[PDB]
Amino acid sequence: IQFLRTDDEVVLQCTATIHKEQQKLCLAAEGFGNRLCFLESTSNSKNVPPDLSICTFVLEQSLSVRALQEMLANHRTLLYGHAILLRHSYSGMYLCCLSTSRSSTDKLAFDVGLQEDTTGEACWWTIHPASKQRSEGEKVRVGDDLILVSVSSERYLHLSYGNSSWHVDAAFQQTLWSVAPISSGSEAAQGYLIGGDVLRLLHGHMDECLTVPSGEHGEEQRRTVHYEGGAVSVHARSLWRLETLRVAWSGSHIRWGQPFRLRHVTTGKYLSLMEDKNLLLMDKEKADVKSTAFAFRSSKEKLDVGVRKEVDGMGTSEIKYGDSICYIQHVDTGLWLTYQIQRKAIMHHEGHMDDGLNLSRSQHEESRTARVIRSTVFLFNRFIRGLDALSKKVKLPTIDLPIESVSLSLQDLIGYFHPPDEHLEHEDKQNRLRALKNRQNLFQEEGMINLVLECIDRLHVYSSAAHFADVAGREAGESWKSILNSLYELLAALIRGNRKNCAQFSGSLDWLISRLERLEASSGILEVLHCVLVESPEALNIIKEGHIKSIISLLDKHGRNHKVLDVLCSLCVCHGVAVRS
Amino acid sequence: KGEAIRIRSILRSLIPLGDLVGVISIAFQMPEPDMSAGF
Amino acid sequence: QNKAEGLGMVTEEGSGEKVLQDDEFTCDLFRFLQLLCEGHNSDFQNYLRTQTGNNTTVNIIISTVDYLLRVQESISDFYWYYSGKDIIDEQGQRNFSKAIQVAKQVFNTLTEYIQGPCTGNQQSLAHSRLWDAVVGFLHVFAHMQMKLSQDSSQIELLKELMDLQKDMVVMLLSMLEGNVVNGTIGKQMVDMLVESSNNVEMILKFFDMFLKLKDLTSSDTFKEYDPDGKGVISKRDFHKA
Amino acid sequence: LILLFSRTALTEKCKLEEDFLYMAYADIMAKSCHSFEEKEMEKQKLLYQQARLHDRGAAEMVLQTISASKGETGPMVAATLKLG
Amino acid sequence: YLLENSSVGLASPAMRGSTPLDVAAASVMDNNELALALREPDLEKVVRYLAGCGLQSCQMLVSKGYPDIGWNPVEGERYLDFLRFAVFCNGESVEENANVVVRLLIRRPECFGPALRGEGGNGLLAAMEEAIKIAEDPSRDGP
Incomplete structure (x- = not known):
């Protein structure tokens, strides 16, 4: 009897009869580095846990x-014939019809x-009563099949x-899509445990989160x-996400004894208990329910499970979410x-005298940053x-080198790490700077910088763009320099802004100077x-005569340029301290 | 009319331009009568 | 038809029933139903709600509410079509008048259904779709009266609009005929009001303007402002007054 | 001046830094403030002075300074408490 | 009524000017009033007949000895001519009929030629080349 409202979580599902085999597929989208949408098999949840976060x-x-037409020219229920605006949950991006x-x-x-433009008719989608018994102008159907039609392209989903x-x-062919009310939003209560959420597992006093190497x-x-x-508490590797076993209404409040x-x-792996x-x-391929299912209990002692x-x-x-005491017990x-x-997290029935757990909300920005870190790594x-x-x-000509995908991911990540505008409000600018610093700190803790240096070295192995093109196809060779520049800008964005990242990268400064004369990555x-020596005096402290002469040789070979002069000025004076040598 | 723009885009996607050029290039047979069959 | 009259057909809108085929027939049918349930005939009202004794029953009340919803949607679409041009032509006036008469007859039929202590009919209309049709009517009436106040050549259409609004509120009163203090119908009506909060606000302000104008006219300084009467006030002079 | 102090307080910083300008002007603003008819008249005068220095964000400035103090006892905290 | 039984009288060169479809077309040909008065129901009915004749061949032709291609072209051409008369009048295109015709065609691509449909993807130019080959080959242009 429930009716879909504005600002609620919904899942688009379709049924398939492939090879006389019934399957349920939900419409998902990666968002970061992959605009294209695909289908994730939400069936067979016992063998493999579905990933509803991207769906x-x-x-x-x-x-x-008519209202949408007028708007373009210039919690509420849904009605048939109205144009809706579907937004991805994790990505925050907006569903549309790409021209390609x-x-x-x-x-x-x-x-x-x-798409993020959010001003074209293709972004909006019109709902229609697929069922013949229902008619246009009625309230929104719930948990049943309707039709979605693009406003501009005039094509069904x-x-x-x-x-x-x-x-x-x-395309121009009907397809039956079922909605799933994950969360109504209005009925959600703050300070209470909610399904489909990421949080930290802390102790009451020992406060040692369930972390992994x-x-x-x-x-x-x-x-x-x-x-x-x-x-380690603030690191992104101390985050655990709860996934409800049921697919519909997965955003409901978690009850005691409910399996999850x-x-x-950070790594994308599900936790499980083997008796041995x-x-x-x-x-998720080998994450069976009988091993990955766990439940929260108010008391250490075990009582019968008579709940609904x-x-x-x-x-x-x-x-409750506010550090409510709970004990995790495996169903099997x-x-x-x-x-x-x-401290080793032993899993034994007698437990311990003090096994209370505190739930820390973490941050939505921290959660999306962690998912971005996992996807990028x-x-x-x-x-x-x-x-x-x-x-x-x-040996194998077929190689998994997604050049376009990695280029798009690098552009998205550079935009993600782009410094805030200085013409904004003071408080907003401070908040954006704090968020950027937090993102850089999380990336450093997860060690993305070393991986960036590793792939930069791998690209630098190839001598030239034409060489790498004949090695790995013409398109990859054409995009080789673009990927290199994107990687260098990404590394500069990661290390720029804070002092700790520059201090850690001081050890790797030698490789920069060694490869300084590549004539293609010289600007990067x-x-x-420049951005590491302006920030970290320790990085400047290890600059030697060979490196300074190498910089001057770069100036001589590549011609007159003021960037080299700025680097020399930074070497000479930093933080109001003169380096006489 | 934006709807007219949509219709024109649909027709453009329906029929390639090069196909139209090929069909407009397919010439006739100059007849000694010849029967009307053909392009 | 507008494209046809622009292009210059011979018929010259001789048969304009393409917009409302049989308004007379619709009015006659609903007037027949109203006369069936006119004299507060409780037995006939209950028979129309449910046909006891017969093997199968149909709900004429629900069918009437559905038809009211359809005509409300049609009027809303016509309002959206004429929302931009800000000018009402004679054909638009005729179509609006026919729609107003049909909707007025439907509203009167519903009132006659729900008059007296007809608990079954009241609950049927409360649980039906009427609560969306009434909100749509309030919205369209507010916007139409806002546009109509400015112009002066459509006063008859404005009066028809106000008459249909009066019939709607009479229908609401007939719904509240047997309202208890802790009335579920009262809760539904106040929910209706909060959903249509804005529209009823411009309606009330529109009434307040003229209700205060009535007392504004009869002021001593306002009366001496025009010695000869018949609106000696110039526009600017009355503005400063 | 009040906006300057507010921006200084809102600026991210690990530990609140001594600011002689802040001390001096907080002291000045605090000292600026301060028979039924005369009691009411002096009450109105006090409200006037408080509103004069307050409608410009003094309350927000005090709250931001106390928040940035981060539970550290200091002369800056003493000055902002006197201002409050 | 004419469009209900417009299927009869088709697939006959002598019946080119004598068919219920022909009189239906003549009743609206070069008449803007009637073109505007045209109806989506029977327009869609004609489109459905076009889809049927583009999905099935002609039983009379195959019985006489004409080769099987999976679709009847003569009835399709006749229905296309009817739709052309419906949409175009007095050297101008009627938007009201054109929009609904385009909607019906895009919803049901079966009305189109098999080459034009994406199921085969043969292409229009290749369709005309194969038609030329049909003309050259007597067996392809069977009895």
């Missing part, structure tokens, strides 16, 4: 056809993606049959959970948390592995050097 959408506002057509077979069919994987494509060791070493106290899935947003070992993280299996809507707000073996800085790792395999061997290296 949930929020309806910003609904206008009628990925599939050649689908003639007069445009791809569906995300058709589901193109993919032999390998079904894909969405705005950082990128210092391999992922096989990071697969172990433990307890570390201190500055713990995911590590401790808690370990594995990818499924509560429609938000439901009763049992678990029924063990309890045990502790005994570096995944993309950079696959790119680096493919590039290294191509460089050292010619010079900018990075």
Whole structure:
């Protein structure tokens, strides 16, 4: 009897009968570095946990056809024939119809993606009562199939049959789409545990969050959970995301004893319990419910589970978010948390006298930054592995080198790290500077800078653009210098602004000067050097005669330029301290 | 009329220009009568 | 039809029923229903609500509310079409007059359905779609009266608009005929008002303007301001007055 | 001047820094402030002075300074408490 | 009524000027009033007939000996001529009819030629080249 309202979380779902096999696919979109939208199989949730974070959408506002036309010329229920505005939850971007057509077979069919312009008719979508029994002008259907039509392109949200994987494509064929009210928004209460949320697991006094090893060791070493106290709390690797087992109304308040899935947003692996070992993280491919399902309990002792299996809507707000004491217990073996800085998180039934857990909200900006970090490290790792395999061997011509994808990701990340405008309000500028500093700190803690240097070295292995083009196709060689410049600007943005990142990069300053004469990355290296020596006196302290003569030689070879003179001025005087040598 | 713009875009995507050029280039057979069959 | 009259067809809008085929037939049908339920005939009202004894029943009340919704949507679309030009032509006046008469007859039929202590009819209309049609009517009436006050050649259309508004509020009173202090119908009506908060505000302000003008005219200084009467006030002179 | 102090307080900084200008002008502004008819008249005068120095954001400036103090006892905190 | 049984009288060169579809077209030909008075219901009905004849061949032609292509071109051409008369009048295009015709055609691409449809993707130029080949080959232009 519920009705969809303005500013609520909805999921677009479609049913497929592929090879006489029924499957449910939800419309998802990466957002960061991938405008194109795809389908994620929300079925088989037991074997593989669905990722609703990139699939949930929020309806910003609904206008009628005439009202939208007038607006273009110049919590509320939804009505048939009105134009809605779908916004991606994690990305914050807006769904639309991209002019490009990925599939050649689908003639007069445009791809569906995300745009930020938010002023074109293609961004808005009109809902229609697919069911013949219902008629236009009635209230919005709930949990059932309707029709979405592009306002400008006048094409339905058709589901193109993919032999390998079904894909969405705005075409002239009907496709039945089911909505899912994840969260109504208005009924949500602050200070209470809400499903589909990222938070930290702290102790009452020991305050040692359930952290995992950082990128210092391999992922096989990071697969172990433990307890570390201190500055590790603010790091992005101390964040756990709760995923409700049920797909519909996954944004409801978490109840005591309700099973859920713990995911590590930094690495993307779900946590699970094997009886023969401790808690370990594995990818979603082998994350079964019987091993990845955990529940919160108010008391250490175990009582019968007589609670309601499924509560429609938000439901009763049992678990509070404000450091409500809880104990995690696995549904299969029924063990309890045990502790005994570096504290091993033993999983044993008797537990301990003090096993209370505090829930820290963290920040939405921190959450999106962590997801961006995970996506970027995944993309950079696959790119680096493919590039290294191509460089050292010619065994497999098929190499995973997404040049366009990595270029788009670099542009998005540079825009993300772009410094705020100085002409804004004082308070707004201060807030943006604080946010940028926090993002740089999180990236440094997660060690993105070393990976950036690694891929820059891999690109610099190739002698020239034409050489790398004949190695890896003409398009990659054409985009080689663009990717190099984007990487150098990204590194400059990461290290610029704060002193700690410059201090850490002081150790790597030698490689900049060694490769200073490449004549193609010279401007980027010079900018990075200037922005590190202006900030870190320690970085300047290790500059030597060989490096200074190298800079002067660069000036001589590349001709007269004031940037080199500015670098020399920074070397001579910094922070009001004269370096006599 | 923006709707007219949409219609023109739909027709442009429907029919390629080069195909129109090819069909406009397909010439006839100069006849000794010839029967009306053909382009 | 507008494109046709612009292009210059021979018919010259001789048959303008393409916009409302049978307004007379619609009015006759709803007047027949109203006369069926005129004299507060409780038995006939209940029979129309539910046909007891028959194997299958239909709800003429719900069908009437649906038709009211359809005509309200049509009037709203016509208002949106004429919202920009800010000028009402004679054909627009005729179409508006026919729509006003049809809607007035439908409203009178609904009032006759819900008159007296007809609890079943009152609950049916409360649970029906009428609460959206009334809000749409308030919106369109506010905007139409705002546009109509400025012009002076459409006073008859303005009066028809006010008459239909009066019939709507009489319908609301007939709904509140048997309202208790803790009335669910009262809660629904106040929810209606808060949903249509803005529209009723410009309606009330529009009435206040003239209600205060009435007392403004009869002031001693205002009366001596025009010695000869018949509006000796110039525009600027009356403005400063 | 009040906006200058407010921006200085809102500027991100690990530890509040001594500012002789802040001390002096906070003291001046604090000292600027301060039979039924005469009691009411002096009450109105006090309200006038408080409003004169207050409608320009003195309350917000005091709150920002106390917030930036970060629970550190200091002469700046003493001056802003006297101003409050 | 004429459009309901306009299927009869088609696929006949002698019936080029004598068909219920022909009289239906003549009843609206060069008449702006009637072109504006045209109706979406029967316009869509004609479009449905076009889709049917573009999805099925002619039983009479295959019985006589004409080759099977999967679609009947003569009835399709006749319906296209009807729609052309409906949309174009007095050297001008009627927007009201043109919009609905375009909507119906884009909703149902089966009305189009198999080459034009994206299922085959043969292309218009290749369609005319294959038509030329049909003309050259007597078997392709079967009895």
